[PDB]
Amino acid sequence: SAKDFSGAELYTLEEVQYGKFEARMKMAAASGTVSSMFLYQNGSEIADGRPWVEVDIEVLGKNPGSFQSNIITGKAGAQKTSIKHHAVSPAADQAFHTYGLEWTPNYVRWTVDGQEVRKTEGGQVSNLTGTQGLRFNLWSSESAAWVGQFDESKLPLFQFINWVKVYKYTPGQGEGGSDFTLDWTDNFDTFDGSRWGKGDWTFDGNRVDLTDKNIYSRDGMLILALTRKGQESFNGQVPRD
Ligand SMILES: [Ca+2]
Ligand SMILES: [Cs+]
């Protein structure tokens, strides 16, 4: 509650089991920063039992021309991971891109602008038990070894989310016999608190406090902000998509 910088974490109030998730966005990048789009079983992090369930897309500000895919299963203190690296062109902070995650009982699939960059079948996928919510966050890590020196002269930084679409898993049903049917679309003309929640917390390793001030709708785009506390409001024009 006392750090000098603020960041963001947006999360769907409801979690689901299987589905397709798409977010049209332009990311923020700078040495030290981290932003991800990820499926997440809330409570996975609580040492008291329960498996860890998570699927990530993560962009490290020091190299916006690339991102990592990952599946984390197991349980805190014995989690299995599968970090892979992928290229993005143009760099995630120079243009809008459609990032997609697909999760069925048999495979997890990652896509950018509707093109596949990874598909995992079986294995860890089998241990993605229960539900997961859809999350997006923007922060800075203290581990310079992982994210790079924290380039403070670069703040304020802003990520822009134009829209999100969430589809249900309907094996065979859906266009061209695909496995998903559109459930809902959020074009972000407003922050819909009946659908989304904003984090208000932090952790050891996070140079920033995630606060509800760092997420807000502006000109038809959702904005996630990384800035000095009190400086969360964007000035200037929203990038066009
Ligand atoms: Ca929009
Ligand atoms: Cs600046």
GROMACS .gro file of C-alpha atoms and ligand atoms in nm:
model
  243
    1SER     CA    1   0.000   0.000   0.000
    2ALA     CA    2   0.310   0.225   0.017
    3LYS     CA    3   0.510   0.176  -0.306
    4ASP     CA    4   0.583   0.473  -0.530
    5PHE     CA    5   0.443   0.324  -0.842
    6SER     CA    6   0.110   0.182  -0.942
    7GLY     CA    7   0.024  -0.087  -1.192
    8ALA     CA    8  -0.279  -0.286  -1.311
    9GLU     CA    9  -0.454  -0.620  -1.296
   10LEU     CA   10  -0.785  -0.673  -1.471
   11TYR     CA   11  -0.978  -0.996  -1.416
   12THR     CA   12  -1.311  -1.143  -1.520
   13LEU     CA   13  -1.536  -1.171  -1.217
   14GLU     CA   14  -1.637  -1.517  -1.338
   15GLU     CA   15  -1.415  -1.814  -1.418
   16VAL     CA   16  -1.508  -2.081  -1.673
   17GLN     CA   17  -1.396  -2.430  -1.776
   18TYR     CA   18  -1.262  -2.445  -2.135
   19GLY     CA   19  -1.325  -2.183  -2.402
   20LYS     CA   20  -1.158  -1.943  -2.643
   21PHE     CA   21  -1.028  -1.599  -2.534
   22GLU     CA   22  -0.923  -1.308  -2.757
   23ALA     CA   23  -0.796  -0.965  -2.673
   24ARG     CA   24  -0.710  -0.696  -2.925
   25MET     CA   25  -0.429  -0.493  -2.779
   26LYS     CA   26  -0.124  -0.274  -2.799
   27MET     CA   27   0.123  -0.344  -2.518
   28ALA     CA   28   0.350  -0.124  -2.306
   29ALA     CA   29   0.718  -0.200  -2.303
   30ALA     CA   30   1.030  -0.079  -2.131
   31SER     CA   31   1.322  -0.234  -1.950
   32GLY     CA   32   1.180  -0.363  -1.624
   33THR     CA   33   0.818  -0.407  -1.730
   34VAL     CA   34   0.595  -0.715  -1.751
   35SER     CA   35   0.246  -0.754  -1.895
   36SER     CA   36   0.052  -1.066  -1.959
   37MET     CA   37  -0.277  -1.205  -2.077
   38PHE     CA   38  -0.351  -1.521  -1.889
   39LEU     CA   39  -0.604  -1.779  -1.783
   40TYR     CA   40  -0.592  -1.827  -1.406
   41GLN     CA   41  -0.765  -2.040  -1.142
   42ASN     CA   42  -0.801  -1.800  -0.852
   43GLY     CA   43  -0.665  -1.948  -0.531
   44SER     CA   44  -0.411  -2.158  -0.722
   45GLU     CA   45  -0.152  -1.956  -0.528
   46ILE     CA   46  -0.273  -2.055  -0.180
   47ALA     CA   47  -0.026  -2.306  -0.029
   48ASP     CA   48  -0.322  -2.484   0.125
   49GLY     CA   49  -0.379  -2.775  -0.108
   50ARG     CA   50  -0.535  -2.727  -0.451
   51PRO     CA   51  -0.347  -2.764  -0.780
   52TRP     CA   52  -0.197  -2.460  -0.950
   53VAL     CA   53  -0.382  -2.388  -1.275
   54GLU     CA   54  -0.257  -2.119  -1.515
   55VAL     CA   55  -0.193  -2.048  -1.887
   56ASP     CA   56   0.015  -1.743  -1.986
   57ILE     CA   57   0.112  -1.506  -2.268
   58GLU     CA   58   0.376  -1.274  -2.126
   59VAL     CA   59   0.560  -0.980  -2.276
   60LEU     CA   60   0.871  -0.854  -2.104
   61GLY     CA   61   0.925  -0.487  -2.181
   62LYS     CA   62   1.295  -0.536  -2.246
   63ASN     CA   63   1.218  -0.738  -2.564
   64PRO     CA   64   0.874  -0.637  -2.702
   65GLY     CA   65   0.947  -0.819  -3.026
   66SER     CA   66   0.891  -1.146  -2.847
   67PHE     CA   67   0.665  -1.313  -2.587
   68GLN     CA   68   0.653  -1.629  -2.376
   69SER     CA   69   0.392  -1.904  -2.365
   70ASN     CA   70   0.360  -2.115  -2.048
   71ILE     CA   71   0.143  -2.368  -1.869
   72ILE     CA   72   0.174  -2.398  -1.494
   73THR     CA   73   0.020  -2.697  -1.329
   74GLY     CA   74   0.096  -2.888  -1.011
   75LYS     CA   75   0.076  -2.689  -0.692
   76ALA     CA   76   0.273  -2.410  -0.529
   77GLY     CA   77   0.611  -2.567  -0.448
   78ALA     CA   78   0.603  -2.843  -0.706
   79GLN     CA   79   0.458  -2.673  -1.013
   80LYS     CA   80   0.538  -2.805  -1.363
   81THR     CA   81   0.611  -2.535  -1.625
   82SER     CA   82   0.673  -2.519  -1.999
   83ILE     CA   83   0.822  -2.182  -2.101
   84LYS     CA   84   0.848  -2.129  -2.481
   85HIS     CA   85   0.949  -1.814  -2.674
   86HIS     CA   86   0.779  -1.666  -2.975
   87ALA     CA   87   0.840  -1.376  -3.208
   88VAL     CA   88   0.584  -1.097  -3.270
   89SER     CA   89   0.595  -0.863  -3.569
   90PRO     CA   90   0.555  -0.575  -3.540
   91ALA     CA   91   0.681  -0.568  -3.179
   92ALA     CA   92   0.400  -0.590  -2.926
   93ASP     CA   93   0.439  -0.217  -2.834
   94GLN     CA   94   0.436  -0.084  -3.192
   95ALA     CA   95   0.104  -0.210  -3.311
   96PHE     CA   96  -0.226  -0.366  -3.211
   97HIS     CA   97  -0.239  -0.749  -3.223
   98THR     CA   98  -0.510  -1.005  -3.151
   99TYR     CA   99  -0.381  -1.241  -2.882
  100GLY     CA  100  -0.569  -1.564  -2.841
  101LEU     CA  101  -0.582  -1.851  -2.592
  102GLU     CA  102  -0.785  -2.170  -2.649
  103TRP     CA  103  -0.839  -2.432  -2.379
  104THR     CA  104  -1.019  -2.765  -2.415
  105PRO     CA  105  -0.981  -3.084  -2.215
  106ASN     CA  106  -0.731  -3.207  -2.476
  107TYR     CA  107  -0.522  -2.912  -2.591
  108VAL     CA  108  -0.423  -2.552  -2.518
  109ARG     CA  109  -0.348  -2.333  -2.819
  110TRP     CA  110  -0.185  -1.988  -2.855
  111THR     CA  111  -0.253  -1.755  -3.143
  112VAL     CA  112  -0.159  -1.407  -3.264
  113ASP     CA  113  -0.364  -1.239  -3.537
  114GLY     CA  114  -0.545  -1.576  -3.579
  115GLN     CA  115  -0.219  -1.761  -3.653
  116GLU     CA  116  -0.092  -2.047  -3.437
  117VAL     CA  117   0.241  -2.009  -3.251
  118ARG     CA  118   0.196  -2.307  -3.018
  119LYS     CA  119  -0.036  -2.595  -2.943
  120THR     CA  120   0.015  -2.833  -2.652
  121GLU     CA  121  -0.172  -3.161  -2.661
  122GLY     CA  122  -0.213  -3.393  -2.360
  123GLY     CA  123   0.046  -3.381  -2.081
  124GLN     CA  124   0.007  -3.072  -1.863
  125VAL     CA  125  -0.325  -2.994  -2.038
  126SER     CA  126  -0.481  -3.290  -1.846
  127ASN     CA  127  -0.398  -3.123  -1.518
  128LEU     CA  128  -0.572  -2.794  -1.605
  129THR     CA  129  -0.859  -2.914  -1.385
  130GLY     CA  130  -1.155  -2.699  -1.280
  131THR     CA  131  -1.209  -2.333  -1.381
  132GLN     CA  132  -0.994  -2.034  -1.477
  133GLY     CA  133  -1.065  -1.664  -1.516
  134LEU     CA  134  -0.921  -1.436  -1.784
  135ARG     CA  135  -0.666  -1.183  -1.658
  136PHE     CA  136  -0.441  -0.902  -1.788
  137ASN     CA  137  -0.178  -0.718  -1.586
  138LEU     CA  138   0.100  -0.455  -1.626
  139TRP     CA  139   0.371  -0.414  -1.365
  140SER     CA  140   0.747  -0.398  -1.303
  141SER     CA  141   0.957  -0.662  -1.134
  142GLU     CA  142   1.243  -0.607  -0.889
  143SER     CA  143   1.427  -0.901  -1.048
  144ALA     CA  144   1.637  -0.700  -1.291
  145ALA     CA  145   1.798  -1.026  -1.388
  146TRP     CA  146   1.464  -1.132  -1.543
  147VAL     CA  147   1.313  -0.805  -1.672
  148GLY     CA  148   1.611  -0.571  -1.699
  149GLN     CA  149   1.707  -0.256  -1.511
  150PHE     CA  150   1.400  -0.058  -1.419
  151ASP     CA  151   1.397   0.229  -1.670
  152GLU     CA  152   1.206   0.485  -1.468
  153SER     CA  153   1.254   0.770  -1.715
  154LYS     CA  154   1.016   0.578  -1.934
  155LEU     CA  155   0.710   0.607  -1.709
  156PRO     CA  156   0.424   0.675  -1.753
  157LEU     CA  157   0.348   0.367  -1.971
  158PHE     CA  158   0.010   0.267  -2.109
  159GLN     CA  159  -0.130  -0.056  -2.254
  160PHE     CA  160  -0.444  -0.035  -2.466
  161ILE     CA  161  -0.711  -0.302  -2.496
  162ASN     CA  162  -0.959  -0.234  -2.779
  163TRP     CA  163  -1.181  -0.540  -2.719
  164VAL     CA  164  -1.213  -0.888  -2.570
  165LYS     CA  165  -1.425  -1.179  -2.699
  166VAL     CA  166  -1.492  -1.493  -2.489
  167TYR     CA  167  -1.629  -1.808  -2.652
  168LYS     CA  168  -1.760  -2.129  -2.501
  169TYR     CA  169  -1.624  -2.471  -2.584
  170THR     CA  170  -1.876  -2.635  -2.820
  171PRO     CA  171  -1.693  -2.934  -2.980
  172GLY     CA  172  -1.786  -2.930  -3.351
  173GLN     CA  173  -2.031  -2.641  -3.322
  174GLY     CA  174  -1.925  -2.303  -3.448
  175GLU     CA  175  -1.801  -2.182  -3.787
  176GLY     CA  176  -1.626  -2.427  -4.017
  177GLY     CA  177  -1.683  -2.697  -3.757
  178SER     CA  178  -1.453  -2.516  -3.511
  179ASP     CA  179  -1.477  -2.589  -3.136
  180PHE     CA  180  -1.602  -2.257  -3.002
  181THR     CA  181  -1.907  -2.034  -3.006
  182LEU     CA  182  -1.899  -1.667  -2.922
  183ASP     CA  183  -2.041  -1.598  -2.579
  184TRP     CA  184  -1.975  -1.225  -2.519
  185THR     CA  185  -1.781  -0.928  -2.655
  186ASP     CA  186  -1.658  -0.627  -2.463
  187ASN     CA  187  -1.574  -0.322  -2.676
  188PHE     CA  188  -1.480  -0.118  -2.366
  189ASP     CA  189  -1.692   0.192  -2.413
  190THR     CA  190  -1.712   0.168  -2.032
  191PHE     CA  191  -1.555  -0.035  -1.754
  192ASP     CA  192  -1.824  -0.291  -1.688
  193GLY     CA  193  -1.794  -0.376  -1.321
  194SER     CA  194  -2.060  -0.644  -1.362
  195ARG     CA  195  -1.817  -0.839  -1.585
  196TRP     CA  196  -1.473  -0.726  -1.464
  197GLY     CA  197  -1.282  -0.662  -1.144
  198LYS     CA  198  -0.963  -0.466  -1.080
  199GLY     CA  199  -0.689  -0.578  -0.845
  200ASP     CA  200  -0.585  -0.379  -0.540
  201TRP     CA  201  -0.278  -0.556  -0.410
  202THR     CA  202   0.088  -0.623  -0.451
  203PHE     CA  203   0.365  -0.865  -0.364
  204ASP     CA  204   0.729  -0.914  -0.277
  205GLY     CA  205   0.897  -0.880  -0.611
  206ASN     CA  206   0.657  -0.619  -0.748
  207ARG     CA  207   0.790  -0.263  -0.755
  208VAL     CA  208   0.430  -0.150  -0.781
  209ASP     CA  209   0.095  -0.169  -0.612
  210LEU     CA  210  -0.179  -0.285  -0.847
  211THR     CA  211  -0.468  -0.043  -0.789
  212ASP     CA  212  -0.816   0.015  -0.930
  213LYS     CA  213  -0.703   0.358  -1.049
  214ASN     CA  214  -0.477   0.200  -1.312
  215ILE     CA  215  -0.759   0.066  -1.524
  216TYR     CA  216  -1.013   0.282  -1.700
  217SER     CA  217  -1.202   0.321  -2.025
  218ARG     CA  218  -1.094   0.608  -2.253
  219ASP     CA  219  -1.225   0.680  -2.603
  220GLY     CA  220  -1.355   0.329  -2.655
  221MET     CA  221  -1.040   0.156  -2.537
  222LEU     CA  222  -0.956   0.012  -2.199
  223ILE     CA  223  -0.630   0.157  -2.062
  224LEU     CA  224  -0.397  -0.019  -1.820
  225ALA     CA  225  -0.146   0.220  -1.664
  226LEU     CA  226   0.205   0.186  -1.518
  227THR     CA  227   0.300   0.516  -1.356
  228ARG     CA  228   0.417   0.699  -1.044
  229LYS     CA  229   0.136   0.702  -0.791
  230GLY     CA  230  -0.116   0.975  -0.855
  231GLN     CA  231  -0.010   1.004  -1.218
  232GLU     CA  232  -0.238   0.726  -1.348
  233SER     CA  233  -0.450   0.937  -1.582
  234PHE     CA  234  -0.342   0.931  -1.946
  235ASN     CA  235  -0.294   1.266  -2.125
  236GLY     CA  236  -0.270   1.266  -2.504
  237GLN     CA  237  -0.439   1.069  -2.777
  238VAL     CA  238  -0.544   0.708  -2.772
  239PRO     CA  239  -0.369   0.513  -3.048
  240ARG     CA  240  -0.586   0.417  -3.341
  241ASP     CA  241  -0.645   0.054  -3.434
  242CA      CA  242  -1.302  -0.081  -2.835
  243CS      CS  243   0.872   0.975  -2.025
   0.00000   0.00000   0.00000
